[PDB]
Amino acid sequence: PQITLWKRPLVTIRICGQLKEALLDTGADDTVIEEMNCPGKWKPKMIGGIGGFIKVRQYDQIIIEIAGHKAIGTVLVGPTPVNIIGRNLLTQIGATLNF
Amino acid sequence: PQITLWKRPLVTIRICGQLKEALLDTGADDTVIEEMNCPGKWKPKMIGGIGGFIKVRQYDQIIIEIAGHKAIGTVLVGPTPVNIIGRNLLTQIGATLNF
Ligand SMILES: CC(C)CN(C[C@@H](O)[C@H](Cc1ccccc1)NC(=O)O[C@H]1CO[C@H]2OCC[C@H]21)S(=O)(=O)c1ccc(N)cc1
Numbered sequence: 001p002q003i004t005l006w007k008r009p010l011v012t013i014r015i016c017g018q019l020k021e022a023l024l025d026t027g028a029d030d031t032v033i034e035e036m037n038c039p040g041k042w043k044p045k046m047i048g049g050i051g052g053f054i055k056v057r058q059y060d061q062i063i064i065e066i067a068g069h070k071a072i073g074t075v076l077v078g079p080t081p082v083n084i085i086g087r088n089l090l091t092q093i094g095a096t097l098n099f
Numbered sequence: 100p101q102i103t104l105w106k107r108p109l110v111t112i113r114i115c116g117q118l119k120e121a122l123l124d125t126g127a128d129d130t131v132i133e134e135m136n137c138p139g140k141w142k143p144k145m146i147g148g149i150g151g152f153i154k155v156r157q158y159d160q161i162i163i164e165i166a167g168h169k170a171i172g173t174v175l176v177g178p179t180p181v182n183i184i185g186r187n188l189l190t191q192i193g194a195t196l197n198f
Contacts, residue, residue, distance in 0.1 A: 002196070005190050008128070009125050023126050026124055026126070027123070027126045027183055049150050049180065050131065051148045051150035067198075090104045090198075091105055093198050095196055096103050097125065099168065
């Protein structure tokens with residue numbers, strides 16, 4: 001599909017059996033998902049943006065479906081105000097920015 | 100151009116006379132640039148990102164060239180970790196996400 005940018009580029013994702021809304025974010029290196037009790041081993045991480053840093057849990061090889069496209073990779077879980085699909089998974093669903 | 104997302108989507112911009120590197124950021128509503136000298140009037144504002152809120156100077160109707168494409172619009176100037184081109188200007192240059 002083609003997504004114009006008049007509005008936030010939100011899509012439906014499925015992660016750990018739950019449907020969520022997430023922002024397709026070319027400015028994010030990594031995918032960051034709102035706090036949820038996913039199973040699996042993790043490593044702590046700090047990620048920084050406007051305002052400073054948040055502490056997150058880094059999970060590797062997590063399966064996510066994004067707007068119907070399957071993906072698998074690193075997902076950071078923590079107190080983000082929005083769910084963000086970053087470049088690590090955008091590349092897997094074939095996303096490009098065009099102008 | 101068509102921009103893939105293996106690497107950060109960095110471009111050269113010209114703003115208030117000066118060349119800077121900036122990140123094309125579909126997850127940003129607004130364009131936020133590091134502290135710099137711009138001429139003319141500004142309004143104090145706040146904006147929040149992943150780590151909290153910062154104070155910025157809002158400049159309106161600023162002429163800004165983005166990878167050779169013209170835009171004229173609002174720029175927030177303040178202590179951002181990365182210069183980001185948000186949707187307010189991405190729409191002006193005709194950017195879309197495609198997958
Ligand atoms: C600042 C960027 C270099 C990186 N950010 C992604 C960015 O797209 C965020 C993504 C974002 C979106 C909403 C809320 C928080 C963070 N947007 C953002 O800060 O935009 C601000 C400017 O416009 C406003 O519109 C949204 C918030 C304001 S980030 O959220 O801080 C971030 C950093 C590291 C990772 N792995 C993932 C995300």
